[PDB]
UniProtKB/Swiss-Prot annotation:
Protein's recorded name: Macrophage metalloelastase
Amino acids binding Zn(2+) 2: 113, 117, 123
GO MF annotations in UniProt: calcium ion binding; collagen binding; core promoter sequence-specific DNA binding; endopeptidase activity; metalloendopeptidase activity; sequence-specific DNA binding; serine-type endopeptidase activity; zinc ion binding
Catalytic residues (positions): 114
Length: 158
């Protein structure tokens, strides 16, 4: 389906989870965008003001769209495919406990998956893929896209 028809993509962090240090939220999101720019022609830039292509939001329960969150556990986040308005936006369930590590739910790993959706990717049936619909923590310091993730994104861009 939809893809971004431009190379320079902006994102904006709407608000910050209290579960984490601010700089750590910024870093996790930045690093997750970098995963995808590594393998596509895309460039991502954080803006502090105005309309971004991808708005990053932390919210709980009903939060103004048709994708109400479900408390701790279950659904961790959801994102919209490329497009105007809410298109591209990535929402993270504040009822989760977001972290930089193996405790709680890892923000980086989740954001890699969510940004995949923000770029136009669907789910994969390969448990090795980051786009597989089940969260499983892997060491983030050595994380890598599966071949499936790479062929999926490269089918959309580059
Ligand atoms: C590693 O990063 C994540 C791993 C799991 C989740 S998750 O929060 O646990 N999660 C899984 C459930 O997804 C469902 O999967 C179905 C089968 O394809 C789809 O029909 C449906 O649209 C989709 O919501 C919702 C998700 O994928 N958000 O993007 C979120 C991020
Ligand atoms: Ca939840
Ligand atoms: Ca948007
Ligand atoms: Ca939280
Ligand atoms: Zn939402
Ligand atoms: Zn998903």
């Amino acid at each position: 389906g939809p893809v971004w028809r431009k190379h320079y993509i902006t994102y904006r962090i709407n608000n910050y989870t209290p579960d984490m240090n601010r700089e750590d939220v910024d870093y996790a999101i930045r690093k997750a965008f970098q995963v995808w720019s590594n393998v596509t022609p895309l460039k991502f830039s954080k803006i502090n003001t105005g309309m971004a292509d991808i708005l990053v939001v932390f919210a709980r329960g009903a939060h103004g769209d048709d994708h109400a969150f479900d408390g701790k556990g279950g659904i961790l986040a959801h994102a919209f495919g490329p497009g105007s308005g809410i298109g591209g936006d990535a929402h993270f369930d504040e009822d989760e406990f977001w972290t930089t590590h193996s405790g709680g739910t890892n923000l980086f790993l989740t954001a890699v998956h969510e940004i995949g959706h923000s770029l136009g990717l669907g789910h994969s049936s390969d448990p090795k893929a980051v786009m597989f619909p089940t969260y499983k923590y892997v060491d983030i310091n050595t994380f890598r896209l599966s071949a499936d993730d790479i062929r999926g994104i490269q089918s959309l861009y580059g």
